[PDB]
Short mmCIF file of C-alpha atoms and ligand atoms in Angstrom, two decimals:
data_model
loop_
_atom_site.label_atom_id
_atom_site.label_comp_id
_atom_site.label_asym_id
_atom_site.label_seq_id
_atom_site.Cartn_x
_atom_site.Cartn_y
_atom_site.Cartn_z
CA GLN A 1 31.69 26.47 -27.58
CA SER A 2 30.07 27.66 -30.89
CA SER A 3 29.63 31.44 -31.41
CA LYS A 4 25.87 31.53 -32.12
CA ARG A 5 24.63 28.94 -29.47
CA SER A 6 26.77 30.45 -26.67
CA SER A 7 25.79 34.12 -27.33
CA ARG A 8 22.04 33.16 -27.03
CA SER A 9 22.12 30.90 -23.92
CA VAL A 10 22.20 33.64 -21.13
CA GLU A 11 21.11 34.14 -17.49
CA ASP A 12 21.94 36.45 -14.49
CA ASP A 13 22.49 35.55 -10.82
CA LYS A 14 20.31 37.00 -7.98
CA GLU A 15 22.75 40.08 -7.88
CA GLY A 16 22.32 40.99 -11.62
CA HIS A 17 25.69 39.65 -12.68
CA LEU A 18 25.88 37.90 -15.96
CA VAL A 19 26.47 34.23 -15.31
CA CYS A 20 29.55 33.45 -17.48
CA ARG A 21 32.88 31.64 -17.44
CA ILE A 22 36.00 31.38 -19.67
CA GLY A 23 34.87 29.78 -23.02
CA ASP A 24 31.52 31.68 -23.16
CA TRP A 25 30.76 34.07 -26.11
CA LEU A 26 28.99 37.46 -26.38
CA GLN A 27 27.56 38.98 -29.71
CA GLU A 28 28.54 35.86 -31.70
CA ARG A 29 31.95 37.73 -31.56
CA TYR A 30 33.77 37.91 -28.15
CA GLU A 31 35.25 34.69 -26.61
CA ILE A 32 36.16 34.97 -22.94
CA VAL A 33 39.70 33.70 -22.44
CA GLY A 34 40.72 35.20 -19.03
CA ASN A 35 39.73 37.18 -15.90
CA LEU A 36 41.19 40.75 -15.51
CA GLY A 37 39.18 42.38 -12.58
CA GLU A 38 35.77 42.60 -10.85
CA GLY A 39 33.96 45.13 -8.56
CA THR A 40 30.44 46.09 -7.56
CA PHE A 41 30.01 47.49 -11.10
CA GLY A 42 30.41 44.08 -12.79
CA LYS A 43 33.49 42.23 -14.22
CA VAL A 44 36.37 42.82 -16.79
CA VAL A 45 37.41 39.77 -18.82
CA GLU A 46 40.04 39.25 -21.52
CA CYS A 47 38.38 38.14 -24.84
CA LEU A 48 39.41 37.18 -28.35
CA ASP A 49 37.57 39.46 -30.84
CA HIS A 50 36.72 36.80 -33.60
CA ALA A 51 35.23 39.61 -35.87
CA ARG A 52 38.83 41.32 -35.83
CA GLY A 53 41.04 38.27 -36.34
CA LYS A 54 41.06 37.05 -32.65
CA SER A 55 42.70 40.26 -31.45
CA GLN A 56 42.70 40.67 -27.61
CA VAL A 57 40.30 42.97 -25.75
CA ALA A 58 39.40 43.83 -22.22
CA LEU A 59 35.59 43.59 -22.04
CA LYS A 60 33.85 45.30 -19.15
CA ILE A 61 30.49 43.69 -18.42
CA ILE A 62 28.29 45.90 -16.19
CA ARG A 63 25.68 44.47 -13.77
CA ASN A 64 21.99 44.33 -14.89
CA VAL A 65 21.11 47.01 -12.16
CA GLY A 66 19.71 50.48 -13.12
CA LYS A 67 22.18 52.59 -11.24
CA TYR A 68 25.27 50.81 -12.85
CA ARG A 69 23.61 50.69 -16.36
CA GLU A 70 22.95 54.41 -16.27
CA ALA A 71 26.53 55.10 -14.99
CA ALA A 72 27.87 52.95 -17.78
CA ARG A 73 25.77 54.93 -20.36
CA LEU A 74 27.47 58.12 -19.16
CA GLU A 75 30.96 56.39 -19.24
CA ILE A 76 30.27 55.41 -22.93
CA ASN A 77 29.47 59.12 -23.68
CA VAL A 78 32.83 60.17 -22.31
CA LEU A 79 34.77 57.45 -24.18
CA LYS A 80 32.92 58.43 -27.43
CA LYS A 81 34.04 62.08 -26.92
CA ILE A 82 37.69 60.92 -26.40
CA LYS A 83 37.56 58.72 -29.55
CA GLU A 84 35.93 61.63 -31.58
CA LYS A 85 38.77 63.95 -30.54
CA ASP A 86 41.83 61.70 -30.78
CA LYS A 87 41.83 60.45 -34.42
CA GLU A 88 45.56 59.63 -34.29
CA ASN A 89 45.03 57.72 -30.84
CA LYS A 90 47.94 59.79 -29.43
CA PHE A 91 46.25 61.19 -26.20
CA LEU A 92 46.82 57.98 -24.19
CA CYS A 93 43.20 57.57 -22.92
CA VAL A 94 42.20 53.88 -23.11
CA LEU A 95 40.86 53.01 -26.62
CA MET A 96 37.21 51.89 -26.68
CA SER A 97 36.76 49.54 -29.64
CA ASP A 98 33.02 48.61 -29.15
CA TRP A 99 30.07 48.98 -26.79
CA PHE A 100 26.75 47.16 -26.67
CA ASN A 101 23.82 46.24 -24.42
CA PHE A 102 23.87 42.50 -23.81
CA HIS A 103 20.50 41.57 -22.16
CA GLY A 104 20.70 44.73 -19.96
CA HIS A 105 24.39 44.40 -19.33
CA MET A 106 26.26 47.44 -20.84
CA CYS A 107 29.56 46.03 -22.20
CA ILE A 108 32.54 48.13 -23.30
CA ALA A 109 35.48 46.60 -25.26
CA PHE A 110 38.90 48.15 -24.81
CA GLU A 111 42.38 47.56 -26.14
CA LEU A 112 44.14 45.00 -23.85
CA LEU A 113 46.97 46.62 -21.70
CA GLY A 114 49.55 45.40 -19.18
CA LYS A 115 49.83 45.71 -15.37
CA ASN A 116 48.67 48.85 -13.61
CA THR A 117 51.45 51.03 -12.16
CA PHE A 118 50.36 50.08 -8.57
CA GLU A 119 50.55 46.35 -9.37
CA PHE A 120 54.06 46.85 -10.88
CA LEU A 121 55.32 48.84 -7.85
CA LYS A 122 54.00 46.10 -5.52
CA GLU A 123 55.69 43.38 -7.56
CA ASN A 124 58.90 45.51 -7.08
CA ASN A 125 58.55 45.33 -3.24
CA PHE A 126 57.47 49.07 -3.49
CA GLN A 127 60.96 49.99 -4.67
CA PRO A 128 60.25 53.29 -6.48
CA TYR A 129 60.34 54.01 -10.21
CA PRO A 130 63.69 55.68 -11.28
CA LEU A 131 63.50 59.34 -11.89
CA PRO A 132 63.60 59.11 -15.68
CA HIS A 133 60.58 56.75 -15.48
CA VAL A 134 58.77 59.18 -13.13
CA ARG A 135 59.51 62.01 -15.66
CA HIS A 136 58.24 60.06 -18.68
CA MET A 137 55.06 58.91 -16.85
CA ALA A 138 54.45 62.44 -15.49
CA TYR A 139 54.75 63.89 -19.12
CA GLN A 140 52.30 61.31 -20.41
CA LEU A 141 49.76 62.00 -17.54
CA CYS A 142 50.05 65.78 -18.16
CA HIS A 143 49.58 65.22 -21.96
CA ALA A 144 46.59 62.74 -21.49
CA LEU A 145 44.67 64.87 -18.96
CA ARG A 146 45.47 68.20 -20.65
CA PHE A 147 43.58 66.67 -23.61
CA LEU A 148 40.75 65.59 -21.34
CA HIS A 149 40.64 68.97 -19.66
CA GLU A 150 40.39 70.85 -23.06
CA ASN A 151 37.20 68.65 -23.72
CA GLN A 152 35.25 69.98 -20.64
CA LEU A 153 36.02 66.63 -18.78
CA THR A 154 37.51 65.76 -15.37
CA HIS A 155 38.47 62.12 -14.67
CA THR A 156 37.99 62.45 -10.82
CA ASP A 157 39.52 59.04 -9.91
CA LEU A 158 43.15 59.20 -11.01
CA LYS A 159 45.27 56.79 -8.97
CA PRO A 160 48.10 54.36 -9.87
CA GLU A 161 45.65 51.46 -10.24
CA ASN A 162 44.00 53.37 -13.20
CA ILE A 163 47.35 53.99 -15.03
CA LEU A 164 48.36 50.89 -16.97
CA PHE A 165 51.47 50.01 -18.90
CA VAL A 166 50.83 49.26 -22.68
CA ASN A 167 53.38 46.49 -21.98
CA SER A 168 54.61 45.82 -18.45
CA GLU A 169 57.49 43.39 -19.44
CA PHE A 170 60.31 44.22 -16.91
CA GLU A 171 64.14 43.83 -16.85
CA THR A 172 65.86 42.53 -13.74
CA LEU A 173 68.58 44.88 -12.48
CA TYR A 174 69.73 42.49 -9.66
CA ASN A 175 68.44 39.31 -8.10
CA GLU A 176 70.42 38.85 -4.72
CA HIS A 177 69.72 35.61 -2.56
CA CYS A 178 63.45 40.94 -3.67
CA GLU A 179 64.33 40.78 -7.42
CA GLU A 180 64.88 44.46 -8.41
CA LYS A 181 62.81 45.30 -11.49
CA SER A 182 62.36 48.14 -14.02
CA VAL A 183 59.68 48.25 -16.68
CA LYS A 184 61.20 48.24 -20.15
CA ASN A 185 58.61 50.47 -21.87
CA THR A 186 57.11 53.27 -19.67
CA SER A 187 54.29 54.08 -22.18
CA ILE A 188 51.03 54.20 -20.16
CA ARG A 189 47.34 54.53 -20.72
CA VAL A 190 44.73 56.10 -18.41
CA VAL A 191 41.67 53.77 -17.73
CA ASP A 192 38.29 53.82 -15.95
CA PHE A 193 36.37 56.86 -17.12
CA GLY A 194 33.42 55.51 -14.97
CA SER A 195 33.54 58.66 -12.74
CA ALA A 196 34.50 61.09 -15.52
CA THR A 197 32.34 64.24 -15.42
CA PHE A 198 31.52 66.83 -18.08
CA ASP A 199 31.59 70.48 -16.90
CA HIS A 200 27.76 70.83 -17.33
CA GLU A 201 26.80 67.59 -15.66
CA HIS A 202 25.97 66.83 -11.98
CA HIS A 203 29.12 66.87 -9.87
CA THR A 204 29.31 63.96 -7.31
CA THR A 205 30.30 65.71 -3.98
CA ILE A 206 32.92 63.27 -2.73
CA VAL A 207 35.08 62.12 -5.66
CA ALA A 208 38.52 60.49 -5.90
CA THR A 209 40.15 57.73 -3.81
CA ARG A 210 41.22 58.97 -0.32
CA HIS A 211 44.96 59.28 -1.07
CA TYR A 212 44.48 61.39 -4.28
CA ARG A 213 41.56 63.45 -3.10
CA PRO A 214 42.13 67.34 -3.06
CA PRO A 215 41.30 69.71 -0.25
CA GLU A 216 38.48 71.48 -2.18
CA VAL A 217 36.69 68.03 -2.29
CA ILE A 218 37.18 67.23 1.44
CA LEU A 219 35.99 70.82 2.23
CA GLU A 220 33.07 70.54 -0.26
CA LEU A 221 33.97 73.92 -2.01
CA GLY A 222 33.16 72.61 -5.46
CA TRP A 223 35.70 70.98 -7.88
CA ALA A 224 36.57 70.86 -11.56
CA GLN A 225 39.79 69.96 -13.66
CA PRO A 226 42.18 71.00 -10.86
CA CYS A 227 41.07 67.93 -8.84
CA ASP A 228 42.86 65.74 -11.38
CA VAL A 229 45.98 67.89 -11.14
CA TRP A 230 46.13 67.28 -7.38
CA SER A 231 45.71 63.59 -7.94
CA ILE A 232 48.67 63.56 -10.49
CA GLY A 233 50.86 65.33 -7.88
CA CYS A 234 50.11 62.68 -5.28
CA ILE A 235 50.69 59.88 -7.98
CA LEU A 236 54.11 61.31 -9.00
CA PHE A 237 55.21 61.41 -5.17
CA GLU A 238 54.07 57.71 -4.89
CA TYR A 239 56.03 56.78 -8.13
CA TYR A 240 59.07 58.60 -6.78
CA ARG A 241 59.14 57.21 -3.19
CA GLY A 242 56.98 54.04 -3.64
CA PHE A 243 54.64 55.03 -0.67
CA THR A 244 51.50 57.28 -0.61
CA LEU A 245 51.96 61.01 0.29
CA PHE A 246 48.79 60.95 2.52
CA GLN A 247 48.58 57.60 4.45
CA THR A 248 45.29 58.55 6.30
CA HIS A 249 41.61 57.50 6.17
CA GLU A 250 40.08 60.41 8.06
CA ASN A 251 39.38 64.01 6.76
CA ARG A 252 40.64 66.16 9.74
CA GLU A 253 43.89 64.16 9.90
CA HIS A 254 44.27 64.29 6.09
CA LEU A 255 43.96 68.15 6.20
CA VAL A 256 46.52 68.33 9.09
CA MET A 257 48.97 66.26 7.03
CA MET A 258 48.37 68.64 4.00
CA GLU A 259 49.29 71.64 6.30
CA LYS A 260 52.41 69.82 7.76
CA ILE A 261 53.63 68.84 4.22
CA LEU A 262 52.55 71.80 2.06
CA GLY A 263 52.03 74.85 4.42
CA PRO A 264 48.96 76.62 5.73
CA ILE A 265 45.50 76.14 4.23
CA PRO A 266 44.37 79.49 2.71
CA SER A 267 42.12 81.45 4.99
CA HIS A 268 39.28 81.85 2.40
CA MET A 269 39.00 78.14 1.99
CA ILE A 270 38.36 77.71 5.86
CA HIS A 271 35.98 80.66 5.83
CA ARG A 272 33.85 79.06 3.01
CA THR A 273 33.81 75.31 4.00
CA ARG A 274 30.66 73.82 5.61
CA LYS A 275 33.09 71.49 7.25
CA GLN A 276 33.47 73.91 10.23
CA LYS A 277 33.71 71.09 12.87
CA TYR A 278 37.33 70.40 11.72
CA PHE A 279 38.38 74.02 12.79
CA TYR A 280 38.37 76.28 15.82
CA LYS A 281 39.19 79.97 15.54
CA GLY A 282 40.30 79.34 11.98
CA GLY A 283 42.88 76.65 12.81
CA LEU A 284 42.59 72.78 12.36
CA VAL A 285 41.71 70.96 15.61
CA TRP A 286 44.69 68.77 16.25
CA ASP A 287 46.27 67.20 19.40
CA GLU A 288 50.05 67.05 18.68
CA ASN A 289 50.90 64.77 21.68
CA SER A 290 48.28 61.84 21.08
CA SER A 291 49.55 58.67 19.23
CA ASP A 292 48.18 60.03 15.91
CA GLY A 293 49.81 63.37 16.71
CA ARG A 294 53.18 61.60 17.19
CA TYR A 295 52.69 59.48 13.92
CA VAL A 296 51.96 62.69 11.99
CA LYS A 297 54.81 64.67 13.79
CA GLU A 298 57.32 61.74 13.02
CA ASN A 299 56.11 60.97 9.46
CA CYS A 300 54.60 64.12 7.82
CA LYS A 301 57.49 66.57 7.04
CA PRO A 302 57.70 69.49 4.49
CA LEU A 303 57.47 68.13 0.88
CA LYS A 304 61.12 69.03 -0.06
CA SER A 305 62.44 66.69 2.79
CA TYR A 306 61.26 63.63 0.72
CA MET A 307 63.80 64.37 -2.07
CA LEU A 308 66.23 61.50 -2.44
CA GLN A 309 68.86 63.54 -4.23
CA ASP A 310 69.82 67.21 -4.37
CA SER A 311 70.51 67.47 -8.22
CA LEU A 312 68.58 69.73 -10.61
CA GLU A 313 66.30 67.02 -12.05
CA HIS A 314 65.02 66.18 -8.47
CA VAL A 315 64.63 69.93 -7.59
CA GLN A 316 62.53 70.34 -10.79
CA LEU A 317 60.36 67.34 -10.06
CA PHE A 318 59.62 68.74 -6.56
CA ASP A 319 58.79 72.17 -7.99
CA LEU A 320 56.29 70.76 -10.48
CA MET A 321 54.79 68.51 -7.61
CA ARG A 322 54.49 71.51 -5.31
CA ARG A 323 52.64 73.42 -8.13
CA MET A 324 50.35 70.43 -8.61
CA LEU A 325 49.71 70.28 -4.79
CA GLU A 326 48.65 74.04 -4.45
CA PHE A 327 45.75 74.11 -1.82
CA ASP A 328 43.76 76.69 -3.75
CA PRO A 329 42.47 74.96 -6.96
CA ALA A 330 42.34 78.39 -8.70
CA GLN A 331 46.17 78.81 -8.14
CA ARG A 332 47.02 75.12 -8.90
CA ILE A 333 49.08 74.70 -12.06
CA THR A 334 47.07 73.62 -15.12
CA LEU A 335 48.25 70.70 -17.19
CA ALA A 336 48.82 72.96 -20.29
CA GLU A 337 51.40 74.95 -17.97
CA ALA A 338 52.75 71.77 -16.48
CA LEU A 339 53.76 70.52 -20.00
CA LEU A 340 56.05 73.64 -20.31
CA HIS A 341 57.71 73.07 -16.87
CA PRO A 342 61.52 72.74 -17.16
CA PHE A 343 61.25 69.28 -15.43
CA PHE A 344 60.46 68.06 -18.92
CA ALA A 345 63.69 69.44 -20.53
CA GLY A 346 65.16 66.07 -19.25
CA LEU A 347 62.90 63.96 -21.68
CA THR A 348 64.34 62.52 -25.02
CA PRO A 349 62.74 62.73 -28.42
CA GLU A 350 61.48 59.02 -28.21
CA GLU A 351 59.86 60.16 -24.77
CA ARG A 352 58.20 63.07 -26.60
CA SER A 353 56.57 60.66 -29.09
C1 EAE B 1 40.80 45.69 -14.96
C2 EAE B 1 41.39 46.91 -15.41
N1 EAE B 1 40.72 47.50 -16.63
C3 EAE B 1 39.68 48.28 -16.66
C4 EAE B 1 38.86 48.61 -15.60
C5 EAE B 1 37.70 49.45 -15.68
C6 EAE B 1 36.93 49.71 -14.41
O1 EAE B 1 37.42 49.99 -16.77
S1 EAE B 1 39.35 48.89 -18.24
C7 EAE B 1 40.71 48.01 -18.95
C8 EAE B 1 41.19 47.94 -20.14
C9 EAE B 1 42.31 47.16 -20.54
C10 EAE B 1 42.94 46.51 -19.48
O2 EAE B 1 43.93 45.66 -19.88
C11 EAE B 1 44.59 44.85 -18.90
C12 EAE B 1 42.58 46.54 -18.21
C13 EAE B 1 41.38 47.34 -17.85
#
């Protein structure tokens, strides 16, 4: 198709999605060449940026629906702040190259990245990342969100699907008659600032994906940057073991697993929560001898039990993870503090770049 003709021939479906396929253009500039993702928000497509010598971008095209348009405007405000504050592009938040309003569709152009860390784990038959990879990805997440936290921002939806490799090319360790895979370059970027909240802005009550959600959110006690620290702790567990720390889809059971894995919920948090129906006389309501009781009993053990090795680097990892999974968000380690944790003495100079 021709740039001008294609960019002006435009229509939406009954749901407010842009009708488009591979080959279509936007802004006499972006040529759609692949599909990367879709949701209720809209769609993400790979494009060639013909105004920047056909360099590759991920273009997010938001639905022509007021709720999603407004949310996208707020997302752009966050991305603009990140860009304003990271002139060397060294804080590892996804680079927004362009944004525009295409017939009511907010569109955001990003640098093109590789597979997300969940997809890579799944392609490795959920065999975990080796500890040095866990350590480098942890360092990068602490560095990226410390920067976001210094700028009165909280991501609120950190999960492995929102952490992408710059380049996900892998090496084969073994291929016996699942092919065992390690990523070559563990450089990552954080994506999807579509839930990211400034300190002064309205806070959505229930944030984060289930498995990465902290106790102060479940208990509706208010949340801020420590929410993201809890998420990171859960992510690092999952990188290290290949399975989620909290495999549950119900609040009371989730809070029970937290107490079995991490120790007792602080008294003051139970006193203050409106979620009183989960408690009786200050203790979580929980039948140990039911089927769910036996699953939790068998599967949810003290955090340290999940160590695969007893050496110093594993002990250091678990100390940092424990500090990231403090119940009380006011006692939870900050990412500025996390960057100084002795776990990160095991990095190399390349890994500090
Ligand atoms: C589809 C994932 N995805 C995004 C998703 C959202 C909701 O923003 S943004 C993004 C940027 C680059 C990329 O490369 C592969 C992927 C990418």
